[PDB]
């Protein structure tokens, strides 16, 4: 997968990050993200970072880890 | 690598985990853990899980993410 299983299992595209534990301005991908390269490329095309977060939906500030 | 870069970049072998945010009874690897398979096997040989943690030191309870 592109994220580990467990709490931090949801791939999101986030505008930025804080201390590799929080994602800021996070949105769900608009494609299936089958590989890490594709996840990174998809988010990058929107200016965002590919993070693995605790929720599968968009929000302004989330617990997220680096992919 | 076996851990992302950033704050949670330190591979440790931890006896257990809590909420994919805490590693419990963590120790540094005693061999080089240069691939995910080697990391997993090494930690498993001590009954432990391969976690990516915020410090490169043995510690009983610290911030760690799933690899
Ligand atoms: C938002 C929390 C960010 C976590 C940073 C962990 C860096 S690891 C460890 O953390 C100790 C506190 O538990 C600090 O006293 C010590 O200086 C630091 O090296």
UniProtKB/Swiss-Prot annotation, chains A, B:
Asked if the keyword Transcription regulation belongs to this entry, the reply reads no
Q: Kindly list the cysteine pairs connected by disulfide bridges.
A: 3-52, 13-43, 14-26, 53-64
> What keyword terms does UniProt attach to this protein?
Cell wall, Conidiation, Disulfide bond, Secreted, Signal, Sporulation
Span within the parent record: 16 to 82 of 86
Q: Does the keyword Signal apply?
A: yes
Relate the protein's function as given in its record.
Aerial growth, conidiation, and dispersal of filamentous fungi in the environment rely upon a capability of their secreting small amphipathic proteins called hydrophobins (HPBs) with low sequence identity. Class I can self-assemble into an outermost layer of rodlet bundles on aerial cell surfaces, conferring cellular hydrophobicity that supports fungal growth, development and dispersal; whereas Class II form highly ordered films at water-air interfaces through intermolecular interactions but contribute nothing to the rodlet structure.
Q: State any GO CC term.
A: extracellular region
The entry summarizes the disruption phenotype as follows: Leads to wettable and fluffy colonies. Results in thinner hyphae and impairs the formation of aerial hyphae.
Protein origin, superkingdom: Eukaryota
Q: What induces it?
A: By C and N starvation, and by light.
Name where it's found. Answer: Secreted; Spore wall; Secreted, Cell wall
The record's note on quaternary structure and interaction partners says: Homodimer. Homodimers further self-assemble to form highly ordered films at water-air interfaces through intermolecular interactions.
**What protein does this entry describe?**
Class II hydrophobin 2
The entry's family comment says: Belongs to the cerato-ulmin hydrophobin family.
Q: Which organism is it from?
A: Hypocrea jecorina (Trichoderma reesei)
